[PDB]
């Protein structure tokens, strides 16, 4: 919704047990809503004190590993679980299945404000780093890189370069920093285009079928495979309203009594994993919140991509 004055590269963050249950219909990498909420929590905890704004996150996923196993004779997968403590009567409690995964990500935070000129870039980058070093990203702790060969320092780069050549070189070197990874972007326009193509293929087709078709492996007879432009994962695109907006005190057992509570339900959209060299500017990968509370549509997305 806004152009950042600088990009804050949080370095390789080792996330221990992230919520691999991204949505009621998808598993694997955590939802972009988790990353946007983590960035908003960074702004709420240290961004205000630095007189800056932290909006926009770039997700690169240098390494992924989910605690999953494949049972013998089945082609699907199951989630490895944890042994919860026993009940008060000494019996095993009912198992609630949750997926927990290991990440290694580096985040590009969009920074705009007066604290960029008020404070040195290295100082605010550092203070954001040790602020994030005691937080959670997707339900998992953050490993702070102690006593390895060398830690990766935080680096903030102002987008207003002295020249176009200097800006282009800075963008390419920042891309070289987060090279063993794949940027995560959203493909709502591609999903709608494929849905229109599917509707011309056969009518009364919903966007759920278009989203399923763009992710499944399709086999066509002469036996070939329908190729995909990219990786094309299905991701939760936000939340849609399910109930009228209640007052902060109406809902029993709320998180607090100062915030209105509205029941919602997941919105499923299209996403893409792509190498960071295939983006014009690294600020095009930033994920933003788009609430629009009048009609629900509590959405997160990455605009200005193409």
């Amino acid at each position: 919704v806004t152009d950042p004055e600088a990009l804050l590269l949080l370095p390789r963050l080792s996330i221990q047990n992230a919520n691999a249950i991204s949505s009621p219909l998808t598993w694997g990498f955590p939802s972009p809503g988790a990353f946007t909420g983590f960035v908003h929590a960074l702004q709420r905890r240290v961004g205000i004190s630095l007189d800056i704004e932290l909006d926009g996150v770039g997700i690169v996923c240098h390494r992924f590993e989910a605690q999953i196993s494949q049972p013998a004779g089945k082609r699907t997968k199951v989630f490895n679980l944890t042994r919860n403590p026993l009940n008060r009567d000494g019996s095993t409690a009912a198992i609630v299945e949750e997926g927990r995964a290991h990440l290694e990500v580096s985040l590009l935070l969009g920074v705009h404000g007066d604290g960029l000129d008020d404070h040195p870039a290295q100082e605010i980058a550092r203070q954001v780093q040790e602020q994030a070093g005691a937080m959670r990203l997707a339900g998992g702790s953050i490993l702070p890189w102690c006593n390895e060969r060398f830690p990766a320092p935080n680096a903030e780069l102002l987008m207003l370069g002295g020249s176009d050549e200097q800006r282009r070189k800075n963008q390419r070197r920042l891309t070289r920093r987060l090279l063993p990874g794949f940027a995560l972007v959203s493909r709502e326009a591609l999903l709608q285009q494929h849905l229109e193509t599917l509707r011309t293929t056969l009518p009364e087709a919903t966007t759920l079928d278009a989203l399923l078709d763009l992710c499944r492996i399709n086999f066509e007879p002469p036996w070939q495979v329908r190729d995909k432009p990219g990786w094309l994962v299905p991701i939760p695109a936000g939340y849609n309203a399910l109930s009228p907006l209640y007052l902060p005190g109406e809902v029993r057992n709320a998180r607090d009594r100062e915030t209105p509570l509205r029941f919602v339900e997941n919105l499923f959209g299209l996403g893409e994993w792509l190498s960071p060299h295939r983006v014009a500017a690294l600020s095009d990968l930033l994920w933003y919140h788009h609430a629009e509370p009048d009609k629900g549509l509590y959405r997160w997305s990455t605009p200005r991509f193409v």
Binding site: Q16, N17, E65, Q67, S69, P71, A72, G73, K74, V78, N80, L81, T82, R83, P85, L86, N87, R88, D89, G90, I95, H102, E130, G133, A134, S141, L143, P144, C146, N147, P151, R252, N253, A254, R255, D256, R257
Partner: protein, 335 residues
């Protein structure tokens, strides 16, 4: 009236990482940054029926017929190499601040009263005893569990990491420090002071804990076993699956946390077990029995409700237990 909060939650303070397992030789523990990792392998086991019979399978003909069918299983096994006798277990520990602050809570008066209760506790005696017991659980190799059982000598090295380097280093003999007695030692008091300062701070204090256990040359080590539900599939599965992060056997983070939480020696039952993990309703998974039952007035919920609502302050040991539960975390609150 100070009604208790409908939604109550506490963040997990004192959270460790996965205990990476690696192997090497004793008297080379200093140059152990390049020690090769312990790998989880596969092997086949053929056993025989040895469980109790249900008075109908005790016929000799049926027993012999069932023995004549071979019992084959595939298990995950982790071993030290045939030229290495020392198992090195390394993990990272973050001691988070804001220890008494709830993560989610409804009632604002309950917020003020609970924060007042924690303030009274911290300016009365603080985390002196709790961090002492946590530093003891760090100093002895309780997080090795079955790896600590038959080791010739165990040494635990704990380093404080401030920016990127060792601000302060510790070295302990884990077998000398008991698993049930919490004495006082100068280095242990320094570690307890650091942990208490981390708990009372606003940021976090980072510790790496490296334990060397002289298991034996080529012996069998015990990483954490993974919980996988069979879910009634027709194919036979592997009976034992071990945990590994990147081709390297590891121990689960919650397993290490349960090892660190074993500080509760104030439960109403006798301390024949010794310390137990700090949990609501005092549950012990190995003993199958939950001490601190709610029929007695020593469970966490009733103690907290009497302490914060009716201002019935419990004993100092029960206050330590309640604050240790606050360190542990959990999702609380009635409907």
């Amino acid at each position: 009236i100070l009604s208790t909060a409908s939604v109550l939650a506490f963040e997990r303070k004192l959270d460790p990482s996965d205990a990476l397992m690696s192997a090497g030789a004793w008297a080379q523990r200093d140059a152990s940054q390049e020690w090769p990792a312990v790998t989880v392998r596969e092997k086949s086991v053929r056993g025989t029926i040895s469980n109790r019979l249900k008075t109908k399978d005790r016929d000799p003909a049926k027993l012999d017929a069932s023995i004549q069918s071979p019992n084959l299983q595939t298990v995950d096994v982790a071993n030290l190499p045939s030229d290495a006798d020392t198992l090195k277990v390394r993990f990272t520990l973050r001691v988070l601040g804001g220890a008494g602050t709830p993560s989610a809570c409804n009632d604002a008066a309950y917020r003020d009263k609970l924060l007042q209760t924690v303030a009274t506790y911290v300016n009365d005696q603080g985390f002196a005893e709790l961090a002492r017991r946590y530093a003891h659980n760090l100093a002895n190799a309780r997080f090795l569990w079955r790896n600590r059982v038959g080791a010739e000598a165990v040494e635990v090295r704990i380093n404080h990491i401030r920016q990127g380097e060792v601000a302060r280093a510790w070295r302990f003999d884990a077998l000398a420090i008991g698993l049930r007695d919490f004495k006082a030692d100068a280095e242990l008091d320094a570690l307890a002071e650091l942990i208490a300062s981390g708990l009372s701070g606003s940021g976090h204090v980072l510790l790496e804990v490296v334990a060397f256990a002289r298991i034996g040359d080529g012996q069998e080590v015990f990483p954490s076993q993974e919980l996988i539900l069979d879910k009634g599939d027709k194919k036979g599965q592997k009976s034992k699956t071990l945990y590994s992060v990147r081709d390297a056997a590891a121990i689960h983070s919650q397993k290490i946390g349960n090892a660190l939480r074993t500080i509760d020696t104030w439960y109403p039952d006798e301390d024949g077990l010794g310390p137990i993990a700090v949990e609501p309703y005092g549950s012990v998974t190995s003993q199958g029995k939950a001490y601190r039952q709610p029929k007695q007035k020593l469970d966490f919920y009733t103690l907290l409700d009497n302490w914060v609502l009716r201002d019935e302050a419990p004993a100092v040991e029960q206050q330590h237990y309640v604050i240790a539960n606050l360190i542990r975390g959990g999702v609380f609150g009635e409907a």
